[PDB]
Design an enzyme around this catalytic site. Structure first.
Site, mmCIF file in Angstrom:
data_model
loop_
_atom_site.group_PDB
_atom_site.id
_atom_site.type_symbol
_atom_site.label_atom_id
_atom_site.label_comp_id
_atom_site.label_asym_id
_atom_site.label_seq_id
_atom_site.Cartn_x
_atom_site.Cartn_y
_atom_site.Cartn_z
ATOM 1 N N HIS A 27 42.125 43.388 27.220
ATOM 2 C CA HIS A 27 40.863 43.989 27.611
ATOM 3 C C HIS A 27 41.027 45.438 28.054
ATOM 4 O O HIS A 27 42.124 45.874 28.423
ATOM 5 C CB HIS A 27 40.170 43.168 28.716
ATOM 6 C CG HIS A 27 41.052 42.797 29.866
ATOM 7 N ND1 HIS A 27 41.978 41.772 29.801
ATOM 8 C CD2 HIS A 27 41.150 43.306 31.119
ATOM 9 C CE1 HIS A 27 42.604 41.674 30.961
ATOM 10 N NE2 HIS A 27 42.122 42.592 31.775
ATOM 11 N N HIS A 68 45.284 45.943 27.889
ATOM 12 C CA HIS A 68 46.360 45.143 28.453
ATOM 13 C C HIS A 68 45.910 43.715 28.766
ATOM 14 O O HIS A 68 44.722 43.391 28.780
ATOM 15 C CB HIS A 68 46.841 45.758 29.758
ATOM 16 C CG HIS A 68 45.855 45.585 30.861
ATOM 17 N ND1 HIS A 68 44.628 46.205 30.839
ATOM 18 C CD2 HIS A 68 45.832 44.736 31.916
ATOM 19 C CE1 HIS A 68 43.884 45.741 31.825
ATOM 20 N NE2 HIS A 68 44.592 44.846 32.493
ATOM 21 N N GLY A 90 47.935 42.462 44.300
ATOM 22 C CA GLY A 90 47.103 42.482 43.111
ATOM 23 C C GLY A 90 47.149 41.201 42.298
ATOM 24 O O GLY A 90 46.170 40.854 41.642
ATOM 25 N N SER A 95 39.424 42.342 42.419
ATOM 26 C CA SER A 95 40.046 41.417 41.479
ATOM 27 C C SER A 95 41.436 40.983 41.930
ATOM 28 O O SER A 95 42.047 41.589 42.818
ATOM 29 C CB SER A 95 40.128 42.025 40.072
ATOM 30 O OG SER A 95 41.113 43.026 39.972
ATOM 31 N N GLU A 132 47.066 40.440 31.607
ATOM 32 C CA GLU A 132 47.550 40.360 32.990
ATOM 33 C C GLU A 132 49.051 40.180 33.061
ATOM 34 O O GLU A 132 49.684 39.775 32.093
ATOM 35 C CB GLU A 132 46.917 39.176 33.727
ATOM 36 C CG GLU A 132 45.426 39.231 33.858
ATOM 37 C CD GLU A 132 44.911 40.620 34.155
ATOM 38 O OE1 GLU A 132 45.192 41.165 35.241
ATOM 39 O OE2 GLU A 132 44.234 41.176 33.274
ATOM 40 N N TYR A 139 38.726 48.315 43.739
ATOM 41 C CA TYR A 139 38.720 49.458 42.827
ATOM 42 C C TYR A 139 37.416 50.223 42.979
ATOM 43 O O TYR A 139 36.347 49.710 42.642
ATOM 44 C CB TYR A 139 38.832 49.026 41.351
ATOM 45 C CG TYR A 139 40.120 48.321 40.979
ATOM 46 C CD1 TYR A 139 40.348 46.999 41.365
ATOM 47 C CD2 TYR A 139 41.128 48.989 40.284
ATOM 48 C CE1 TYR A 139 41.550 46.356 41.075
ATOM 49 C CE2 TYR A 139 42.333 48.362 39.987
ATOM 50 C CZ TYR A 139 42.542 47.047 40.389
ATOM 51 O OH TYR A 139 43.746 46.425 40.133
#
Ligand SMILES: O=C(O)CC[C@@H](O)C(=O)O
Ligand SMILES: [Cl-]
Ligand code: NI
Ligand SMILES: [Zn+2]
Length: 349
Positions: free
Chosen positions: A270, A182, A164, A282, A184, A171
Protein backbone atom coordinates in the site's frame (compact mmCIF):
# COMPACT_ATOMS: atom_id res chain seq x y z
CA UNK A 1 -14.20 -18.03 -4.25
CA UNK A 2 -15.12 -14.80 -2.39
CA UNK A 3 -14.32 -11.27 -3.66
CA UNK A 4 -12.73 -12.64 -6.89
CA UNK A 5 -12.35 -9.01 -7.96
CA UNK A 6 -9.96 -8.59 -5.05
CA UNK A 7 -11.50 -5.11 -4.75
CA UNK A 8 -11.25 -2.95 -1.63
CA UNK A 9 -14.32 -3.63 0.55
CA UNK A 10 -16.02 -1.48 3.18
CA UNK A 11 -17.74 -2.73 6.35
CA UNK A 12 -20.22 -1.11 8.78
CA UNK A 13 -20.21 -3.23 11.95
CA UNK A 14 -22.83 -2.76 14.65
CA UNK A 15 -21.58 -2.08 18.20
CA UNK A 16 -22.05 -5.79 18.97
CA UNK A 17 -19.90 -6.98 16.07
CA UNK A 18 -17.39 -4.23 16.80
CA UNK A 19 -16.46 -5.28 20.37
CA UNK A 20 -14.44 -8.38 19.48
CA UNK A 21 -11.62 -7.13 17.29
CA UNK A 22 -9.93 -10.38 16.29
CA UNK A 23 -13.37 -11.84 15.70
CA UNK A 24 -14.47 -9.13 13.26
CA UNK A 25 -11.17 -9.46 11.36
CA UNK A 26 -12.00 -13.13 11.07
CA UNK A 27 -15.41 -12.12 9.71
CA UNK A 28 -14.22 -9.71 6.99
CA UNK A 29 -11.70 -12.31 5.93
CA UNK A 30 -14.61 -14.77 5.59
CA UNK A 31 -16.03 -12.23 3.13
CA UNK A 32 -12.81 -12.10 1.11
CA UNK A 33 -11.70 -8.63 2.27
CA UNK A 34 -8.05 -9.60 2.65
CA UNK A 35 -7.78 -10.48 -1.05
CA UNK A 36 -7.57 -6.76 -1.87
CA UNK A 37 -4.82 -6.24 0.71
CA UNK A 38 -6.69 -3.27 2.11
CA UNK A 39 -10.15 -2.75 3.62
CA UNK A 40 -12.22 0.01 5.23
CA UNK A 41 -14.21 -0.37 8.42
CA UNK A 42 -16.62 2.42 9.40
CA UNK A 43 -17.15 2.20 13.19
CA UNK A 44 -20.67 2.48 14.74
CA UNK A 45 -21.99 6.04 14.98
CA UNK A 46 -22.04 5.67 18.78
CA UNK A 47 -18.30 4.99 18.91
CA UNK A 48 -15.60 7.55 19.73
CA UNK A 49 -12.03 6.87 21.00
CA UNK A 50 -11.66 10.33 22.50
CA UNK A 51 -14.01 13.06 23.70
CA UNK A 52 -12.15 16.09 22.31
CA UNK A 53 -8.95 16.75 20.34
CA UNK A 54 -8.63 20.35 21.44
CA UNK A 55 -6.18 19.48 24.19
CA UNK A 56 -3.22 18.17 22.17
CA UNK A 57 -1.89 21.43 20.77
CA UNK A 58 1.01 21.08 23.20
CA UNK A 59 1.74 17.48 22.22
CA UNK A 60 5.32 17.30 20.95
CA UNK A 61 6.48 15.85 17.60
CA UNK A 62 10.12 15.02 18.52
CA UNK A 63 11.26 14.24 14.96
CA UNK A 64 9.35 16.05 12.20
CA UNK A 65 10.28 14.88 8.72
CA UNK A 66 10.67 17.00 5.59
CA UNK A 67 9.88 14.88 2.54
CA UNK A 68 12.09 15.63 -0.46
CA UNK A 69 10.84 13.82 -3.52
CA UNK A 70 12.94 13.24 -6.59
CA UNK A 71 11.84 11.59 -9.81
CA UNK A 72 9.90 11.78 -13.05
CA UNK A 73 7.23 10.06 -15.14
CA UNK A 74 5.55 8.18 -12.30
CA UNK A 75 8.68 6.87 -10.51
CA UNK A 76 10.03 8.67 -7.44
CA UNK A 77 12.36 8.25 -4.48
CA UNK A 78 11.58 10.04 -1.25
CA UNK A 79 14.32 11.32 1.04
CA UNK A 80 13.77 12.29 4.67
CA UNK A 81 15.21 15.38 6.31
CA UNK A 82 14.62 15.41 10.05
CA UNK A 83 13.70 18.82 11.41
CA UNK A 84 13.80 20.05 15.01
CA UNK A 85 10.98 19.02 17.35
CA UNK A 86 7.73 20.98 17.32
CA UNK A 87 4.24 20.97 18.80
CA UNK A 88 0.98 19.94 17.15
CA UNK A 89 0.06 23.63 17.24
CA UNK A 90 3.25 24.70 15.45
CA UNK A 91 2.82 21.90 12.94
CA UNK A 92 -0.77 22.83 12.16
CA UNK A 93 0.20 26.50 11.87
CA UNK A 94 2.58 25.40 9.11
CA UNK A 95 0.17 22.87 7.59
CA UNK A 96 -2.44 25.57 7.13
CA UNK A 97 -0.14 28.34 5.90
CA UNK A 98 -0.88 29.32 2.28
CA UNK A 99 2.50 27.73 1.58
CA UNK A 100 1.60 24.15 2.45
CA UNK A 101 -2.19 24.16 2.40
CA UNK A 102 -4.45 22.07 0.17
CA UNK A 103 -4.99 23.36 -3.36
CA UNK A 104 -8.51 24.20 -4.53
CA UNK A 105 -10.25 21.35 -6.35
CA UNK A 106 -13.61 19.80 -7.24
CA UNK A 107 -13.44 16.01 -7.56
CA UNK A 108 -10.85 13.76 -5.91
CA UNK A 109 -9.55 12.76 -9.34
CA UNK A 110 -8.33 16.38 -9.59
CA UNK A 111 -6.51 16.50 -6.22
CA UNK A 112 -4.95 13.19 -7.21
CA UNK A 113 -3.63 14.59 -10.52
CA UNK A 114 -2.24 17.62 -8.66
CA UNK A 115 -0.55 15.38 -6.11
CA UNK A 116 1.17 13.29 -8.81
CA UNK A 117 2.08 16.46 -10.68
CA UNK A 118 3.57 18.47 -7.80
CA UNK A 119 4.89 15.97 -5.28
CA UNK A 120 8.47 16.86 -6.18
CA UNK A 121 7.90 20.59 -5.45
CA UNK A 122 7.59 22.45 -2.14
CA UNK A 123 8.62 19.56 0.20
CA UNK A 124 6.14 19.23 3.08
CA UNK A 125 6.72 18.26 6.70
CA UNK A 126 5.34 15.02 8.15
CA UNK A 127 4.88 14.54 11.88
CA UNK A 128 5.23 10.79 11.61
CA UNK A 129 6.30 7.94 13.86
CA UNK A 130 5.19 9.75 16.98
CA UNK A 131 5.11 7.54 20.06
CA UNK A 132 1.75 7.75 21.74
CA UNK A 133 -1.96 7.25 21.42
CA UNK A 134 -4.98 9.53 21.32
CA UNK A 135 -7.29 6.80 22.63
CA UNK A 136 -9.15 7.37 25.90
CA UNK A 137 -7.93 4.93 28.60
CA UNK A 138 -11.33 3.27 28.96
CA UNK A 139 -12.12 2.64 25.27
CA UNK A 140 -12.54 -1.11 24.99
CA UNK A 141 -13.43 -1.46 21.33
CA UNK A 142 -10.64 -1.40 18.73
CA UNK A 143 -8.21 0.38 21.03
CA UNK A 144 -4.97 0.46 19.05
CA UNK A 145 -3.13 0.48 22.37
CA UNK A 146 -4.47 -2.97 23.23
CA UNK A 147 -6.12 -4.93 20.39
CA UNK A 148 -5.39 -8.18 22.21
CA UNK A 149 -4.30 -10.37 19.28
CA UNK A 150 -1.70 -13.14 19.18
CA UNK A 151 0.96 -10.56 18.27
CA UNK A 152 1.01 -10.04 22.04
CA UNK A 153 3.03 -13.24 22.30
CA UNK A 154 6.07 -11.12 21.47
CA UNK A 155 6.14 -8.78 24.46
CA UNK A 156 4.43 -11.28 26.76
CA UNK A 157 7.08 -13.96 26.10
CA UNK A 158 10.22 -11.86 25.68
CA UNK A 159 9.35 -8.42 27.05
CA UNK A 160 10.41 -6.96 23.72
CA UNK A 161 8.47 -3.93 22.50
CA UNK A 162 8.93 -2.63 18.95
CA UNK A 163 7.76 0.97 18.60
CA UNK A 164 5.04 1.13 15.96
CA UNK A 165 4.62 -2.65 15.69
CA UNK A 166 3.28 -3.62 19.12
CA UNK A 167 2.85 -0.01 20.36
CA UNK A 168 0.84 2.84 18.70
CA UNK A 169 2.20 5.56 16.41
CA UNK A 170 0.62 8.93 15.74
CA UNK A 171 1.05 10.61 12.34
CA UNK A 172 0.30 14.31 11.90
CA UNK A 173 0.12 15.13 8.22
CA UNK A 174 -0.41 17.97 5.77
CA UNK A 175 -1.10 18.28 2.03
CA UNK A 176 1.25 16.28 -0.21
CA UNK A 177 2.83 14.32 2.65
CA UNK A 178 2.97 10.68 1.69
CA UNK A 179 3.86 7.08 2.41
CA UNK A 180 5.78 4.97 -0.06
CA UNK A 181 4.84 1.52 -1.25
CA UNK A 182 5.39 -1.29 1.25
CA UNK A 183 4.00 -4.14 3.33
CA UNK A 184 4.22 -4.24 7.15
CA UNK A 185 7.26 -5.42 9.03
CA UNK A 186 7.26 -9.23 9.17
CA UNK A 187 4.34 -8.83 6.74
CA UNK A 188 1.99 -8.29 9.68
CA UNK A 189 -1.47 -6.79 9.57
CA UNK A 190 -1.98 -3.13 10.14
CA UNK A 191 -4.75 -1.03 11.66
CA UNK A 192 -5.07 2.68 10.94
CA UNK A 193 -7.51 5.13 12.43
CA UNK A 194 -7.83 8.74 11.26
CA UNK A 195 -8.71 10.66 14.42
CA UNK A 196 -9.42 13.89 12.49
CA UNK A 197 -8.48 16.32 9.75
CA UNK A 198 -8.46 15.97 5.98
CA UNK A 199 -8.74 12.68 4.11
CA UNK A 200 -5.92 10.19 3.51
CA UNK A 201 -5.99 8.45 0.13
CA UNK A 202 -4.73 4.88 -0.32
CA UNK A 203 -3.48 2.73 -3.16
CA UNK A 204 -3.44 -1.04 -2.76
CA UNK A 205 -2.10 -4.02 -4.66
CA UNK A 206 -3.69 -7.44 -3.98
CA UNK A 207 -1.40 -9.74 -1.95
CA UNK A 208 -1.90 -12.32 -4.67
CA UNK A 209 -0.20 -9.85 -7.07
CA UNK A 210 2.44 -8.49 -4.72
CA UNK A 211 5.30 -10.34 -6.43
CA UNK A 212 4.37 -8.62 -9.68
CA UNK A 213 4.71 -5.24 -8.01
CA UNK A 214 8.16 -6.14 -6.56
CA UNK A 215 9.26 -7.43 -9.96
CA UNK A 216 8.30 -4.09 -11.50
CA UNK A 217 9.96 -2.06 -8.74
CA UNK A 218 13.14 -4.10 -9.09
CA UNK A 219 13.28 -3.34 -12.81
CA UNK A 220 12.81 0.39 -12.23
CA UNK A 221 15.22 0.67 -9.32
CA UNK A 222 17.87 -1.98 -10.13
CA UNK A 223 20.41 -0.16 -7.96
CA UNK A 224 18.38 -0.33 -4.76
CA UNK A 225 17.48 -3.92 -5.68
CA UNK A 226 21.12 -5.03 -5.90
CA UNK A 227 21.84 -3.43 -2.50
CA UNK A 228 18.90 -4.93 -0.64
CA UNK A 229 16.61 -7.96 -0.86
CA UNK A 230 13.62 -5.84 0.15
CA UNK A 231 14.45 -2.21 -0.64
CA UNK A 232 10.75 -1.36 -0.66
CA UNK A 233 10.85 -1.75 3.15
CA UNK A 234 12.89 1.49 3.32
CA UNK A 235 9.58 3.15 2.42
CA UNK A 236 11.20 5.54 -0.05
CA UNK A 237 9.68 4.36 -3.28
CA UNK A 238 6.70 6.08 -4.86
CA UNK A 239 5.00 4.68 -7.97
CA UNK A 240 2.05 6.42 -9.63
CA UNK A 241 -1.20 4.55 -10.45
CA UNK A 242 -0.65 5.40 -14.09
CA UNK A 243 2.66 3.55 -14.05
CA UNK A 244 1.01 0.55 -12.41
CA UNK A 245 -1.82 0.73 -14.91
CA UNK A 246 0.68 0.92 -17.79
CA UNK A 247 2.49 -2.22 -16.63
CA UNK A 248 -0.62 -4.19 -15.78
CA UNK A 249 -0.32 -4.25 -12.01
CA UNK A 250 -3.75 -4.88 -10.45
CA UNK A 251 -4.46 -2.21 -7.86
CA UNK A 252 -7.35 -0.36 -6.28
CA UNK A 253 -7.73 3.02 -4.55
CA UNK A 254 -9.75 4.45 -1.69
CA UNK A 255 -9.98 7.61 0.34
CA UNK A 256 -10.06 7.22 4.10
CA UNK A 257 -11.90 9.93 6.02
CA UNK A 258 -11.70 11.14 9.62
CA UNK A 259 -13.35 8.58 11.89
CA UNK A 260 -12.84 5.60 9.57
CA UNK A 261 -10.52 2.59 10.01
CA UNK A 262 -8.26 1.08 7.36
CA UNK A 263 -6.94 -2.49 7.72
CA UNK A 264 -3.99 -3.75 5.68
CA UNK A 265 -3.40 -7.46 5.41
CA UNK A 266 -0.26 -9.65 5.33
CA UNK A 267 1.74 -8.94 2.17
CA UNK A 268 -0.62 -6.21 1.04
CA UNK A 269 1.38 -3.46 -0.60
CA UNK A 270 0.00 0.00 0.00
CA UNK A 271 0.88 3.67 -0.53
CA UNK A 272 -0.95 6.99 -0.35
CA UNK A 273 -0.97 10.65 0.62
CA UNK A 274 -2.72 13.08 2.98
CA UNK A 275 -5.13 15.67 1.58
CA UNK A 276 -4.12 18.17 4.26
CA UNK A 277 -3.63 18.63 7.99
CA UNK A 278 -4.79 15.53 9.86
CA UNK A 279 -3.89 13.02 12.52
CA UNK A 280 -3.81 9.24 12.27
CA UNK A 281 -2.89 6.42 14.65
CA UNK A 282 -1.69 2.94 13.72
CA UNK A 283 0.10 -0.19 14.92
CA UNK A 284 0.40 -3.80 13.72
CA UNK A 285 -1.45 -6.95 14.80
CA UNK A 286 -1.68 -10.59 13.81
CA UNK A 287 -3.91 -13.62 13.29
CA UNK A 288 -3.00 -17.29 12.97
CA UNK A 289 -2.95 -16.92 9.18
CA UNK A 290 -0.13 -14.38 9.63
CA UNK A 291 2.29 -16.85 11.22
CA UNK A 292 3.08 -18.38 7.83
CA UNK A 293 3.67 -14.94 6.33
CA UNK A 294 6.01 -14.14 9.20
CA UNK A 295 8.04 -17.30 8.67
CA UNK A 296 8.48 -16.37 5.01
CA UNK A 297 8.76 -12.58 5.16
CA UNK A 298 11.76 -11.42 3.10
CA UNK A 299 13.48 -8.91 5.33
CA UNK A 300 15.62 -5.86 4.75
CA UNK A 301 19.21 -7.14 4.65
CA UNK A 302 21.16 -3.85 4.74
CA UNK A 303 19.94 -1.76 7.68
CA UNK A 304 20.46 -2.36 11.39
CA UNK A 305 17.71 -1.89 13.98
CA UNK A 306 15.44 -3.16 11.17
CA UNK A 307 12.41 -4.98 12.59
CA UNK A 308 12.86 -8.73 12.96
CA UNK A 309 10.57 -10.83 15.14
CA UNK A 310 11.48 -14.35 16.29
CA UNK A 311 8.88 -16.74 14.81
CA UNK A 312 9.83 -19.59 17.23
CA UNK A 313 7.15 -19.07 19.86
CA UNK A 314 4.44 -18.83 17.19
CA UNK A 315 5.53 -21.93 15.27
CA UNK A 316 5.97 -23.84 18.53
CA UNK A 317 2.58 -22.82 19.94
CA UNK A 318 0.42 -22.86 16.77
CA UNK A 319 2.32 -25.19 14.41
CA UNK A 320 3.82 -27.79 16.78
CA UNK A 321 3.61 -30.52 14.16
CA UNK A 322 5.87 -28.46 11.90
CA UNK A 323 8.30 -27.04 14.46
CA UNK A 324 11.10 -29.57 14.00
CA UNK A 325 10.53 -29.55 10.25
CA UNK A 326 10.62 -25.71 10.19
CA UNK A 327 13.57 -25.59 12.56
CA UNK A 328 15.42 -27.92 10.19
CA UNK A 329 14.55 -25.46 7.42
CA UNK A 330 12.53 -28.16 5.67
CA UNK A 331 9.09 -26.53 5.88
CA UNK A 332 8.10 -25.69 2.30
CA UNK A 333 4.52 -24.58 2.89
CA UNK A 334 3.22 -22.49 0.01
CA UNK A 335 0.99 -19.58 1.00
CA UNK A 336 -2.48 -19.17 -0.55
CA UNK A 337 -3.37 -15.49 -0.33
CA UNK A 338 -7.06 -16.21 -0.93
CA UNK A 339 -7.70 -18.41 2.12
CA UNK A 340 -9.16 -16.61 5.13
CA UNK A 341 -7.56 -17.02 8.57
CA UNK A 342 -8.74 -20.17 10.44
CA UNK A 343 -10.53 -18.03 13.04
CA UNK A 344 -13.08 -17.28 10.31
CA UNK A 345 -14.23 -20.93 10.33
CA UNK A 346 -17.36 -20.12 12.29
CA UNK A 347 -18.45 -17.65 9.57
CA UNK A 348 -18.09 -20.12 6.68
CA UNK A 349 -20.70 -22.63 7.92
O1 LIG B 1 2.06 2.00 6.09
C1 LIG B 1 0.93 1.97 6.64
O2 LIG B 1 0.36 0.96 7.09
C2 LIG B 1 0.20 3.31 6.79
C3 LIG B 1 1.19 4.47 6.93
C4 LIG B 1 0.46 5.80 7.06
O3 LIG B 1 -0.26 5.84 8.29
C5 LIG B 1 1.47 6.95 7.02
O4 LIG B 1 1.05 8.09 7.29
O5 LIG B 1 2.65 6.65 6.72
CL1 LIG C 1 -7.94 19.57 16.11
NI1 NI D 1 1.86 0.10 6.26
ZN1 LIG E 1 17.43 -2.65 3.27
Amino acid sequence: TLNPSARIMTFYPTMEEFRNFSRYIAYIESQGAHRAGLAKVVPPKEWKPRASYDDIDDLVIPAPIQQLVTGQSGLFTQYNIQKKAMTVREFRKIANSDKYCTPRYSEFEELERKYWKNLTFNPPIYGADVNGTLYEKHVDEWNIGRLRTILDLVEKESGITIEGVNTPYLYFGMWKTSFAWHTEDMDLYSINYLHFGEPKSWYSVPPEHGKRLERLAKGFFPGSAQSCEAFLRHKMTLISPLMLKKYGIPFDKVTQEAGEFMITFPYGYHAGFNHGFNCAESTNFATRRWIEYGKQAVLCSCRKDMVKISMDVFVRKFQPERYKLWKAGKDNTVIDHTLPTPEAAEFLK
